[PDB]
Amino acid sequence: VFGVAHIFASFNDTFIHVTDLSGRETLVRITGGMKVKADRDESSPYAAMLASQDVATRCKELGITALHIKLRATGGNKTKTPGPGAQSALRALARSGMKIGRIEDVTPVPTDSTRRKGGRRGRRL
Template sequence: MVKHAAEEASSSNLQSAAQAPSPESVAAPEPPRQTGTRWGICHIFSSYNNTIMHVTDMTGSETIGIVSGGQMVKSDRLESSPTTAMAGARKLAELCLDKGVTGVHIRIRAPGGHNGPMTPGPGAQAVVRTLSRRGLKIGLIEDVTPIPHGGCRKKGGKRGRRV
């Protein structure tokens, strides 16, 4: 009986030594993955002449990426087109995903103010669609066009613009 117990103990020690991994085969532990969404703010300025897309962190102080329609095409007349805005948004989405931003809140701005149009240009809607198709989560969509509150006198003289 004593012999059998000693043999079992030595055989169990051999098995545990065979199962223990060698130090060379042990891989370094993977860094913990963030399960939450890292958010940024996408500022879109869309006029009838150009579309500018700018992604910042949530405080607005650090730029993650900036792209304009003029960087995508050579001719000036194509800077504000939806096709150019889509190409810029694709590039911007890649920049965001490379830097770890997986969701954006969108702030759309038209020229506005006293003289500019209050509606965004043709590229704004194309940018929002492209960002969502490229895998970024879309949070809030907000219109931040400047609105005049009285202010300066409009041009046109005493009798206004005569047509």
């Protein structure tokens, strides 16, 4: 029995969003920041560790046994490199007791995008 795990793995946060095979109903949506105290801990891979353990437990308690993963970065006119939490989420969400069906990156990549935040010289810090 198959679900779909939308792993939004950006910086500053990480989302683990499980739906049915259509994407129209969210069985469970556990967020890394739901599982930590620090607005800086909300993006560390550990947050994704336990926020994926709870996805797995609330997924066994709903029935779907195998999971089509779909990883996704910030996308658009931003980074395309997944946040630290992507690999942590896959690692924990596989070994917490679960079956992964198919991996795929669905990060938004534009044929070419609108102007990107920062100005010409960009973020100089």
